Amino acid sequence: ALVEQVRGQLQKLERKYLELKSQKNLYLARLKSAIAAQKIEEIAGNLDNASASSLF
Amino acid sequence: APEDLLERLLGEMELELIELRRALAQTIATFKSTERQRDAQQLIAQRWYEKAQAALDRGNEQLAREALGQRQSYQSHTEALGKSLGEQRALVEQVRGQLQKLERKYLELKSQKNLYLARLKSAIAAQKIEEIAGNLDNASASSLFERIETKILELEAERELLNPPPSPLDKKFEQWEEQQAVEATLAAMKARRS
Structure with missing residues (x-):
């Protein structure tokens, strides 16, 4: 009984374990995507023509 | 570590399964020495027996009297040693038992040591997978996966105020006008090109 239960x-x-490792890829990918999408919208905000100290 | 004593304590016991092994050797050695002494005594008595077996013949019982009288001193020694040998036999057999x-x-105990150690090393291991999993378990209990998810929520939400989404009012027309922007052009087409 001991050998069978421990194998279970x-x-x-x-x-x-492998289920957890699969999710790590997805969450990291979404994170690296989310951080990137921000700064385009921020650098655009620098140059956005919004009369908010925009360079243009 | 209590698990370490189990090996050392059993190590100590290997010293006496040999030391006690010496004690039985000495006891049996003494028994053989007593056995040898008894054999020698009866041989002298046998020689004096044979010497009286030479004397009493042919009419000289009187010299047999002295020889037997001499033999009695040796007979007494034989009896005393004889019973000691029988008594000592019990000691050697009991101690061997x-x-x-x-x-x-001993070997029965050593077998169990392997099992208990194996279960222990297994039990300690099973714990920490369930603990490291608990660190990463997605249980909203300071789980790392959890703070990642909400960290993503704030990035997206902060972008929304930076670039507001369309108002519903605008949403209503960009569909409502496109319907004729497609139908009106297509109403011209469905009239122009029907």
């Missing part, structure tokens, strides 16, 4: 733990845990 | 009983109990 490893089988259950191993599956849960 | 102790060693036989104890030796079996």
Whole structure:
């Protein structure tokens, strides 16, 4: 009984690991995307023609 | 670490399964020495027995009397040693039983040490996966994944005030006008090109 139960733990845990690793890629990708989208809209805000100390 | 004692304590016990092994050797050695002494005594008595077996023949019982009288001194020694040898036999057998009983109990203990250590090293390991998972578990309990998600929420939201989304009023026409911007052009087309 001991050998079978402990193997079940490893089988259950191993599956849960690769599932977590998959999500890490998605969250990082969204983050690197979200940070990038901001500063275009900020650099555009610098040059936006909004009469808010815009260079243009 | 309590787990380390289990090895050292068993290490100490390997000293006596050999030390007690010496004690039995000495006891049996003494028994053989007593056995040898008894054999020598009876040989002298046998020689004096044979010497009286030479005397009493042919009519000289009187010299047999002295020889047997001399033999009695040697007979007394034989009896005393004889019973000691029998008594000492019990000691050697009983002590061996102790060693036989104890030796079996040792290897049985050593077998269990492997199992308990294995379960322990397993149990400690299973914990921290469930703890490191708890760090990353998505449970909103200071989980790293969680603060990432809301960090993303603020970036997108801060951009919205920086660049406001369209008002519903504008939304209504850019569909409402495009319908004729498509139909009116297409109403011309559906009239021009029908």
